[PDB]
Amino acid sequence: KRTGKPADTPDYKQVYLPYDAAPTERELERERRRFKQAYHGRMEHRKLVEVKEVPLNVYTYGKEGMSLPIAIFKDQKDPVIGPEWTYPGIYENKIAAQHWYTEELFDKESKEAFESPWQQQILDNQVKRRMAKVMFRMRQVNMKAVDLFQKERGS
RNA sequence: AAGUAUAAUUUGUAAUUCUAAAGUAUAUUUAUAUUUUUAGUAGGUAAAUGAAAAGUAUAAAUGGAUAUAACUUAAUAUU
Ligand SMILES: [Mg+2]
């Protein structure tokens, strides 16, 4: 929908340099060439997908000294991305913020091995999302019979 | 993620339908009784090629040689 979408797109401003050692442009290519391909899905169906809009500079993309164009107020200065360790639980998220297929989390819990302590909570919230899916129709089937997938799909 | 989604309704929302529990009672059987596993009496036996001691006469007054075609005939009675 065309509602709640930016009708303009300002640019990035790079405030301070995250490094003092300037890269050779071959380093700027060899890191970028590493980025253009990424993995999608984590299970038996897992497919490499090529990534659109891979930045010119990998070293300076998100990790410090860049001011985001997410500013809102008048006196709001574009927020400068700080150092990594000052952002809480980021290293802990990198472990656990990833697509977790249910089967796969489950097997980890059974083997009593979790990459992060949090993947308990990652599992518990998946189950609750699934069962909700079950609990919704059971409030909908009550009021009127709703038959799953008998209608013609598309045109 | 701090249970927001496979519906109905609406131009699009919103509001309102709805928001998961379910057991015992009635959902124990009949048997006896009836149409065909038997004897007793008759009565050769296990199923289809008739019987005449009276003309086959010495026999002459009470001898049954009464032994029997359902479609073509002949005559007669009917409806
Ligand atoms: Mg109500």
Partners of A127 in the β-ladder:
none
Per residue in A5-29, is it b (16+ CB within 10 Å) or e — as a string? Answer: eeeeeeeeeeeeeeeeeeeeeeebe
User: Does the nearest atom of strand B lie within 7 Å of A34's Cβ?
Assistant: no
In angstroms, the CA A81 to CA A64 distance is: 5
> Beta-carbon neighbour count of residue A93 at 10 Å?
13
Q: Using the CB atom, is residue A126 less than 7 Å from strand B?
A: yes
Instruction: Quote the tokens at residue A146.
Output: 């709703």
Contacts 24+ apart (CB under 8 A), A29-34: A31/A58, A31/A59, A32/A56, A32/A58, A34/A58
| Whole-Å CA distances, A9 to A12, A39, A41, A67, A144 | 10, 28, 30, 14, 47
Chain Cα centroid distance, residue A52: 15
What's the A103 CA to ligand 1 centre distance in angstroms?
Answer: 38
**Closest by CA position to A104, among listed A38, A40, A41:** A41
Q: How far apart are CA A109 and CA A120, in angstroms?
A: 8
Contacts of A17 (CB under 8 A, 6+ apart): A60, A65
Query: 10 Å Cβ neighbour count for A118?
Result: 15
**Nearest protein residue, CA measured to C1' of B6:** A148
Kindly report the backbone phi and psi dihedral angles of residue A80, in degrees, each rounded to the nearest multiple of 5, phi listed first: -90, 125
Q: In Å, what is the separation between the CA of A54 and the C1' of B14?
A: 42
How far apart CA A18 and CA A14 sit, in angstroms, is 10
DSSP 8-state symbol, A80:
B
| DSSP assignment of A101-127 | -HHHHHHHHHHT--SSTTHHHHHHHHH
- Rounded-to-integer distance, Cα A128 and Cα A136, Å: 12
Measure A12 CA to ligand 1 centroid, in angstroms.
Answer: 52
Distance A67 CA to B49 C1' (A): 140
- Nearest nucleotide to A121 by CA–C1' distance? B1
CA distances from A79 to A19, A64, A133, A146 (A): 19, 11, 39, 50
Distance in angstroms: CA A103, C1' B22: 33
* CA A109 – CA A76 distance, rounded (Å): 45
Strand B contact at CB of residue A137, distance < 7 A: yes
